[PDB]
Amino acid sequence: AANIMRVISIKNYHSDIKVIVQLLQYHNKAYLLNIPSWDWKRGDDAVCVAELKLGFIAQSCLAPGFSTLMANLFTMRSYKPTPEMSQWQTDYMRGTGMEMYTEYLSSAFNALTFPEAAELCFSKLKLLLLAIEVRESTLAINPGPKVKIENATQGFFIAESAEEVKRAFYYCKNCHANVSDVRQIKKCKC
Amino acid sequence: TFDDAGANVPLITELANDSNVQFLDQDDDDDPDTELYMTQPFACGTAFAVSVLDSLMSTSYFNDNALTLIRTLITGGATPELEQILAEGAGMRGGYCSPAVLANRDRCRVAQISLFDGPLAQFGQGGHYGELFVYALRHFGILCIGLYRFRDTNPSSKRYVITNPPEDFPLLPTDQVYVLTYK
Amino acid sequence: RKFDSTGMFHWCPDRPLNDCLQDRSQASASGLRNHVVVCLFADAASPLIGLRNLVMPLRASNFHYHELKPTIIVGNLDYLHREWKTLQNFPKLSILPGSPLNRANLRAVNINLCDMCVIVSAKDRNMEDPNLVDKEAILCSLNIKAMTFDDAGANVPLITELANDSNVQFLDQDDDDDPDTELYMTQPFACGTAFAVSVLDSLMSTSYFNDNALTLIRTLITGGATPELEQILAEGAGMRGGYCSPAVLANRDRCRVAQISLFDGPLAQFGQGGHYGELFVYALRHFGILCIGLYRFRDTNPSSKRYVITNPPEDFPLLPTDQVYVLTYK
Ligand SMILES: [Ca+2]
Ligand SMILES: [Ca+2]
Ligand SMILES: [Ca+2]
Questions:
Q1: Residues 6 or more apart whose Cβ sits within 8 Å of residue B144
Q2: Which of C174, B49, B62 is nearest to A20 (CA)?
Q3: Smallest Cα–Cα separation from C73: which of C47, C99, C48?
Q4: Where does Ca(2+) 2 bind (chain C) (predicted)?
Q5: Helices then strands (H, E): number in chain A?
Q6: Is B73 helix (H, G, I), strand (E, B) or coil?
């Protein structure tokens, strides 16, 4: 109730501010969806921790450890070894170095299917591409061979840093295509 | 204990206070200065707590579409049209549905598959994660996002999760693979 | 028909609340149009606001029974059962139990067809910090203002009581809010969309300086509650009534505050670029209609908002869209 009255006060002062609000209870969301000037298409959003909590653990009923797989993607962390860690802890912690990033696919991806683009990102770029913004426009997760990469398609990657995913934007089918070590994929390949 | 057990029952527990995670498990080597995400019960998918969600605020600012991605997965598909319908207060309206809307029954789902048997078992028998990834994507459109590996490789049924392994990461025949799939 | 024993109000023999309770299907099946909706926020234990003081004016005996506005109360049922002992004598009354925030309720109520929606609260007037006290009423106002209707939204007529005057800034948009402005200068008050108890406080000083002026306002705002009715109610037997003699029934010609439009009919000649003093003298002479102010659109060039102009100058220009506040006998 206190946070809804802050949203109302912000939106009363100026309607077009993007407001992002943390809500503790799901039934309280309806009250702010009904504010006249709240608009999810303008980017307003309510991070409902009750909805999200139960959603993450419910996916663990479908895939037993998935709440941990997925919650680690949404906090920024860098992998940092220490010699007392067992093998399983180092494997785990390297996995926690991952986050999910959005970046534009380079023109070298144009007219590939999503499966070719995902094979290419994984094998050459060391990037796990898992979804794309299909141009209104809509998110598609792991789309089948029927979906081509259109020009300037935004892709969704799992990677260790934003410095990694840039490689999808800089990759070039003539200039970089023979590179052995991914650190050399750089500088737009002009 | 059960007649024809115990620690083999699959559990997930929400914790109201993160530092209580140390009591949740034994054979564990507890330390109160370790943050929740490094603890064995969290690394095994046995614990959850609201504190790991907090950077949904910052990610909601930096890329709105990524917050919609996670949602379509974790909610199973709750679009803003359903949130609008629920905000009318009439309850969740439903019935028999047209083939035009029923087309959306092919959403992508997060699934888990075992390397113990079937066509992928060839990779579980000492192959590498990148071989498995390229094969599964090509033949089945199955996109692999991680592994769920036993901790005691030599005892317990506990398993840990490995998000996005390296291309040359070795597989074990007991590994389970997290995947995105359409069927 | 039957009246209160002093002739002043329309009256009905008692009933149980279940004669007037309705579910959403019954409310939706009813022809609710031009009605009054009361969005009552209450807990079962919260204090009695005395809704009779709301309903009794709406039942002035100088109205004919066919022009009495139907009334529907949306609110907590356990509260209404302890209010009901006071309401049970009024005709054309109905209850839809449930929250006023539930848009279902509002739609069954035909909220888009009412002549006024009243938002009112029985809750504790200092339950938390001064930012939270009116959140139920503000959310209800914003909710109704945001609804859409099939053949709307901001066109629904609203009046909201505020427990804390400085919350009036949240009640409206396109507004230019400022916390140092006192309530009476704010746009929602100037439009007749807000009310709060603080504007009543100088009834104490005016009650001292001229007692008769306090009786004037009362005869108007109560619709005619004379001290004889207050005595009858103080006997605790409830509001006694029945069929009434022609001698008392003569008092059905009280003067009423009414509102008339310059868009059409005999006065439209003044709306077409005349002056308020021409209108005043004409209406008084031909009809005995005494004009006390105007209700003018704010956006003369958009929104349906209107502002009130008490007693304009003789040479004040009229617009064809103006509505006139008047005192009248028919
Ligand atoms: Ca990282
Ligand atoms: Ca422990
Ligand atoms: Ca305002």
A1: B129, B132, B133, B136, B137, B177, B178, B179
A2: B62
A3: C99
A4: 169, 172, 175, 177
A5: 7, 6
A6: helix
Question: At what resolution in Å was this solved?
Answer: 2.9
- Of B170, B80, B82, B183, which is closest to residue B123 (Cα–Cα)? B170
Which helix (H) or strand (E) segment holds residue A155: the answer is strand A154-159
HSE-up (13 A, CA, CB side) for residue A160: 12
Which residues 37-96 on chain B approach chain A with CB closer than 8 angstroms?
Answer: 37-38, 42-45, 48, 50, 52-61, 63-75, 80, 83-84, 86-87, 89
Longest CA pairwise span in chain B (Å): 57
DSSP C154: G
Name A43's Cβ contacts closer than 8 Å, sequence gap at least 6.
Answer: A18, B64
- What letter represents residue C177's amino acid? D
Give me the residue label for tokens 């597989």. Answer: B171
For residue A130, give both structure tokens. Answer: 């898992």
Give the separation between CA C121 and CA C40, rounded to whole angstroms.
6
Distances (CA, A) of C303 to C148, C156, C271: 16, 12, 20
CA of B5 to the centre of ligand 3 (A): 63
C43 marked among binding-site residues: no
Q: Name residues whose C-beta falls within 8 Å of residue A152's C-beta, 6 or more positions apart in sequence.
A: A104, A105
The position carrying tokens 């024993």 is C5
State in Å: Cα A98 to ligand 1 middle. 5
Chains that touch B (3 or more CB pairs under 8 A): A, C
Specify whether the CB–CB gap between A4 and A31 falls below 8 A: yes
Q: CB of B128 within 8 A of CB of B165?
A: no
Q: How far is CA C261 from CA B74, C295, C321, in A?
A: 57, 9, 7
Element (H, E) at C277: helix C276-287
Experimental method: cryo-EM
Nearest 5°: phi and psi at B76? 75, 0
